[PDB]
Assembly symmetry: C3
Homo-oligomer: 151 residues x 3
């Protein structure tokens, strides 16, 4: 009997937490975050070469932005447009030229390559950048692009 009362009490505490937290979710994502589905993109707000950008995301418990649908790509694009800086995606073809994969090693399930890309320009573009127009282009990993991680 006391348990039924203890349960109701917990119900009230949970409802409170749920409500308060929903508000802080909005506050937190402003202005550098974007929620799409169960994924959250967040930009560090600055540019870094691929290797450094990758380390920043992984050490933070996430990974570089990896849009796997038109919906996610559009969400990521909003951050890129807002910062007016193209960003690096997580995928590369460093292992096998022409074969882009996620950090897991799996093949792409979605892509939004600009016409003619990837073209491995100069024979040395193994990373991927997303333009403010939302399209993808393979680019030199040594370049510095906006750091956007996904969680």
């Amino acid at each position: 009997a006391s348990l039924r009362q203890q349960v109701e009490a917990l119900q009230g505490q949970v409802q409170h937490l749920q409500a308060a937290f929903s508000q802080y979710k909005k506050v937190e994502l402003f202005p550098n975050g974007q929620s799409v589905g169960e994924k959250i993109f967040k930009t560090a707000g600055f540019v870094k070469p691929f290797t450094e950008a990758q380390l920043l995301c992984t050490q933070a418990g996430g990974q570089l932005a990896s849009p796997r649908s038109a919906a996610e790509n559009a969400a990521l694009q909003q951050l890129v447009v807002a910062k007016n800086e193209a960003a690096f995606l997580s995928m590369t073809d460093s292992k096998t030229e022409g074969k882009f994969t996620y950090p897991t090693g799996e093949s792409l399930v979605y892509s939004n390559w600009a016409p003619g890309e990837p073209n491995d320009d100069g024979g040395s573009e193994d990373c991927v950048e997303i333009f403010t127009n939302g399209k993808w282009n393979d680019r030199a990993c040594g370049e510095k692009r906006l750091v956007v991680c996904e969680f």
Copy 2:
């Protein structure tokens, strides 16, 4: 009766969440947010013209800062002072000159105008900025001011 040991686990989970959530709130608000009552003000840390600022807040799930009491205005003022950048409020008299209203449409229920304001200087001041001193002044919507949203 095993339900009793399960309730005990739940109680522990909720207390842990209450403690973690409270700590997280302080972290989030530092150093660009202010909690006042049920409202939360948060600055984007940069400036933008009115239209742009308004869009940013709306798309983020909130709206431009709309202080409705001396208490809210003081909370907002802290952010303005910290950043040393005057900010736009959500209110405007763009529809009917001389009559400032909220994004919703209702008339002002609180105001903290500087002496002599609003004066529609140049016959073209329909937006509202709040100075580091906390006072309000009607200013051209085309000017760039600190973006501060409320949630």
Copy 3:
């Protein structure tokens, strides 16, 4: 006794909340915060003299970074390195020259002084800064250093 089904329900809500909270926490800390044990360090991203930095942290419900172990120091070093700006710690020897203490008055339980430090150079170094290499140096409280608070 559908209380067993009622407990099942809350079990699900609490776990759903635990998952969302864990995700938003990681997002929150990227890229200006660092979690170590139950402590959370977060930098404001800018510099301020000691008194102003201390006030910012206290007003935020926390205090200046106070590394109490090699683990916490390394965590704080990450933020300093990321911003490439030495930061102030909370400890000072203002009360009794030579004896550094925490805001509570307790003497240090951990230190990471650089060789030759602390030296009270010039006869007036009562604050402490942590370099990008993680070592400490007593420095004039009037200098402006990175603001990092702990919650």
